[PDB]
């Protein structure tokens, strides 16, 4: 097998996710104490818009 093959080390994902037919990355969090979830998610949207 060494006669007709070359070998290398690469980096690749052992797990691939997809959301509604599109590739994706899942992210989990908690809104800090004394804060709602709607505002946390609004901040997440703001951060994502950039």
């Amino acid at each position: 097998f060494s006669a007709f093959s070359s070998s290398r080390w690469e980096y690749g994902s052992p797990r691939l996710e997809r959301y509604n037919g599109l590739p994706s990355m899942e992210i989990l969090g908690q809104a800090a104490p004394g804060k709602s979830t709607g505002e946390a998610m609004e901040l997440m949207e703001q951060l994502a818009s950039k």
Binding site: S6, S7, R8, W9, Y11
Partner: protein, 152 residues
């Protein structure tokens, strides 16, 4: 201690400097023989390679198959880390267990800048791999005439 690997991965310059002030092994290898230089060149982290070079990092190291960080910085298009590793002193004609110099890697991906740099720094164009192929044949097969001319 061995946080240097996961730090060069995420690209943490301040933390790398901290841990190297604490006296962390700069040439700490992983199960595949890679060093923070390998990872910083695979993920394009120039600040970190500069730092590690300021602190005694072997730039001609080789993994369990014979790939120096030059192979990685050339097979990806890191035109600046190539120059850095070359200036700091790196074997520009290095070979792996398959007989492949960074010329072939920069040619297959069609990176002209890195090819010109390596040739300026003394890269043998008449090299041959375990199958007898050089960079010119690579350019021929890939149908890239710009590199084919640049190789003359």
């Amino acid at each position: 201690g061995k946080k240097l690997l996961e730090a060069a991965r995420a690209g943490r310059d301040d933390e790398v400097r901290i841990l190297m002030a604490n006296g962390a092994d700069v040439n700490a290898a992983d199960v595949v023989g890679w060093t923070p230089l390998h990872l910083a060149a695979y993920w394009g982290h120039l600040e970190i390679v500069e730092v590690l070079l300021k602190n005694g990092a072997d730039v001609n190291a080789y993994d369990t198959l014979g790939s120096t960080p030059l192979h990685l910085a050339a097979h990806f298009g890191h035109l600046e880390i190539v120059e850095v590793l070359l200036k700091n002193g790196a074997d520009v004609n290095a070979k792996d267990d398959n007989g492949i110099t960074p010329l072939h890697l920069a040619a297959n991906r069609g990176h002209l800048e890195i090819v010109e740099v390596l040739l300026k720094y003394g890269a043998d164009v008449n090299a041959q791999d375990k199958f007898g192929k050089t960079a010119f044949d690579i350019s021929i097969n890939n149908g890239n005439e710009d590199l084919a001319e640049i190789l003359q």
